[PDB]
Amino acid sequence: EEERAFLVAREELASALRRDSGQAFSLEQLRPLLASSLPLAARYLQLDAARLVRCNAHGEPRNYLNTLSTALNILEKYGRNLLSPQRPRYWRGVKFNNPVFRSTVDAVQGGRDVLRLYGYTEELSFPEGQEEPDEHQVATVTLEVLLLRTELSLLLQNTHPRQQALEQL
């Protein structure tokens, strides 16, 4: 009933990302995804947002939410790359020893599992059978990653429309 209204908007913005990879989203456009009474598992279907937040929630929120948002900012770019009309050269390969990754994403519990959602299944890299990334899935994960980074930033600045429910994590 009301979960459908969320999914429609969720899909409509996912489609937007597939058309334009560098498409930017305001808080005005993200509104129906932010002000929905749904729980976390019903709003993040691919991303395990609950585990990403609570398993890195040690210390001060002003510090772990920024470490978390920093990782989500890179993960979103990992997605936008696969969606670009021309994809980067070494797109199918992600090395742990890589500077940007280990310094950012691999500093967060569950950062790797997000890449597996993108398509990097064989252990990270794409399987040989996969010659090109799934345009629908990536855009969906990228949207959820972007959505989570957005929610955390509204948490850090105490403006989230459901701030008095998310702080239970």
Binding site: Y78, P88, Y90, W91, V94, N98, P99, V100
Partner: peptide, 4 residues
């Protein structure tokens, strides 16, 4: 950068 992000792949190396």
């Amino acid at each position: 950068d992000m792949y190396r």
